[PDB]
Amino acid sequence: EGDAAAGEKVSKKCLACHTFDQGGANKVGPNLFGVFENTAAHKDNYAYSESYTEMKAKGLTWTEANLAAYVKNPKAFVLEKSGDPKAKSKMTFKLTKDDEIENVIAYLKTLK
Numbered sequence: 838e839g840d841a842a843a844g845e846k847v848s849k850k851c852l853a854c855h856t857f858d859q860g861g862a863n864k865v866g867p868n869l870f871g872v873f874e875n876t877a878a879h880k881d882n883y884a885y886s887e888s889y890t891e892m893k894a895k896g897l898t899w900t901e902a903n904l905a906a907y908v909k910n911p912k913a914f915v916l917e918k919s920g921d922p923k924a925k926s927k928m929t930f931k932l933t934k935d936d937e938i939e940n941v942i943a944y945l946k947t948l949k
């Protein structure tokens with residue numbers, strides 16, 4: 838699903854916090870090149886909330902279905918999938934429109 842050319846437009850919503858180029862800086866959140874199909878807590882130089890280290894332990898990977906649930910409500914996601922009731926997420930920003938979600942994902946699949 839998903840027009841990755843509409844997804845690149847949508848992604849402009851993420852750019853205050855994230856960069857998308859390979860080797861790019863960790864501005865507020867981690868750089869997201871390579872995120873697709875990679876583990877949770879994928880960037881070794883970023884200090885993630887413990888909750889993302891615990892999805893990583895459980896072997897969660899960023900599939901199209903897990904990105905879709907996550908970007909809709911990051912905080913509910915990391916509670917659910919970590920199984921840690923005191924789970925925190927520094928993200929918080931949500932996408933609420935389904936077309937937007939599917940399009941953003943289609944563009945994250947182009948970045949490795």
Ligand code: HEC
Pocket residue numbers: 847848850851852853854855865866867869872876877878879880884885886889899908925926927928930932941
């Ligand atoms: C716009 C639609 C986006 C998208 C596609 C992503 N975010 Fe963020 N994000 C932020 C923070 C501070 C983090 C780390 C959270 C913490 O450790 O508690 C993240 C993390 C991500 C991920 C997970 C990457 C991983 O390696 O597990 C993903 C897939 C992701 N984001 C996608 C901060 C921000 C924002 C700051 C206000 C904004 C806006 C976004 N993120 C927007 C998006």
